[PDB]
Amino acid sequence: GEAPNQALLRILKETEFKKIKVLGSGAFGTVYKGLWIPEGEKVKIPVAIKELREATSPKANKEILDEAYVMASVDNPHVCRLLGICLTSTVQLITQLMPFGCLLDYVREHKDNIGSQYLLNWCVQIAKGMNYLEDRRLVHRDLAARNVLVKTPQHVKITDFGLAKLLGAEEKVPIKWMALESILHRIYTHQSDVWSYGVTVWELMTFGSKPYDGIPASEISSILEKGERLPQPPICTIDVYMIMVKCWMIDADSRPKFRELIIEFSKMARDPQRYLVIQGDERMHLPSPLMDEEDMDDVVDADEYLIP
Numbered sequence: 254g255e256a257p258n259q260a261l262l263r264i265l266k267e268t269e270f271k272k273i274k275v276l277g278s279g280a281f282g283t284v285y286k287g288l289w290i291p292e293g294e295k296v297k298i299p300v301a302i303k304e305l306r307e308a309t310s311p312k313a314n315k316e317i318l319d320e321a322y323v324m325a326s327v328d329n330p331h332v333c334r335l336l337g338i339c340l341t342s343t344v345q346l347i348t349q350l351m352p353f354g355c356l357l358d359y360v361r362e363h364k365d366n367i368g369s370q371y372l373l374n375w376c377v378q379i380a381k382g383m384n385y386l387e388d389r390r391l392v393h394r395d396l397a398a399r400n401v402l403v404k405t406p407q408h409v410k411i412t413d414f415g416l417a418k419l420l421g422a423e424e425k426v427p428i429k430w431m432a433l434e435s436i437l438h439r440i441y442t443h444q445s446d447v448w449s450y451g452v453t454v455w456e457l458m459t460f461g462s463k464p465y466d467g468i469p470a471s472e473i474s475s476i477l478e479k480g481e482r483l484p485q486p487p488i489c490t491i492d493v494y495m496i497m498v499k500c501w502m503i504d505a506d507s508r509p510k511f512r513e514l515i516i517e518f519s520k521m522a523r524d525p526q527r528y529l530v531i532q533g534d535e536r537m538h539l540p541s542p543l544m545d546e547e548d549m550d551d552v553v554d555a556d557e558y559l560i561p
C-alpha cells in the first residue's frame with residue numbers, strides 16, 4: 254500500500270544451475286526442473302525454472318518481471334516465493350521445485366487414493382495462503398487448482414502471480430473461475446478471489462472435473478446472471494457445498510472471508526468423514542518425501558535454505 258517493499262531480488266548465474274530437464278510447456282511458457290548450487294555454499298537446491306514463451310518480445314519480459322516482483326515479495330508457507338532470477342537472453346524465474354506438480358493434475362492422477370482429510374486440509378492450506386495474500390493486500394486474480402502446487406501430499410502452496418495486483422491499483426482471462434462483477438465490470442477484489450477459491454474447491458471436490466464443461470466461455474456471464482452455479486459434487490455433504498455456494502454470491506461482501514474459510518474448513522478437518530463421503534476412505538495412504546538422481550546427500554529443500 255505505502256510501506257516500502259524491501260524484498261531482496263536475488264540474481265543468479267547460469268553457472269549455478271547444474272542438471273536441467275523439461276517439466277512442462279504450452280506456448281504460454283516453459284517450466285524446467287533443475288538443481289541450483291548456491292556458489293560458496295555446500296547445498297543442492299531442487300528448483301523449477303520458468304522461461305516464459307513469446308521469444309523475447311519485450312512485451313514478455315515486462316510480464317515476466319512483474320511476476321518475479323510479486324513472487325519475490327511473498328513469504329508464507331502456503332505461497333511459493335521467488336528464489337531469484339537469472340538473466341540470459343530471456344529472463345528465467347527460479348523457485349522451489351514442487352515435486353508432485355499441480356494440485357489439478359494430482360487429483361486427476363490419484364482420484365482413488367485421495368482421502369477426505371487430504372481434501373479438506375488442502376482447503377485449509379489454500380485459504381491460509383490466500384488470507385496471507387489478502388494481508389499483503391494482493392489480489393491473486395487467477396486462483397485455480399492448476400495454480401496450486403504440491404510440495405508433498407500434505408502441503409500445498411499457491412503460485413502463478415502473472416495477474417496479481419494490489420487492491421485498488423489499476424490494470425489469458427480465465428472466465429470459469431471469475432466472479433460475476435469481474436466478468437461484467439472488471440471489478441476485482443479480495444472477495445472475487447473468494448469466488449475463485451470456491452471454484453478451486455469445487456475442482457478438488459470433483460477430483461478435477463472441468464467447470465461448466467459443455468458451456469463455452471462466451472455465455473458464462475449469461476448463465477451466472479440467471480443464477481446457475483456449479484452442481485454439488487457427489488462426495489460433498491450439504492455443509493461443504495453450502496460453503497461453496499456462499500462463495501458464489503452475487504453480493505461480494507456476503508461471500509465468506511479467507512479467514513472465515515480457514516476456520517470453517519479447519520473445524521471440518523477434525524471430523525473429515527462427517528463432511529466428505531468418499532468410497533472406502535479410511536486407510537487411504539499417499540506417497541511422501543523425494544529421491545532420484547546421482548549424489549544427493551547435500552540436497553536441501555528451499556524451505557530450509559534461508560538467507561539473512
Ligand SMILES: */C=C\C(=O)Nc1ccc2ncnc(Nc3cccc(Br)c3)c2c1
Pocket residue numbers: 276277284300301302303346347348349350351352353354355356358399402412413414
Ligand atoms: C501442473 C504444471 C506445473 O505448474 N508444474 C509445475 C511443477 C513444479 C513447479 N515448481 C515450481 N514452480 C512451478 N511453476 C512455476 C510458476 C511460476 C514461476 C515459477 Br519459477 C514456477 C512448478 C510447476
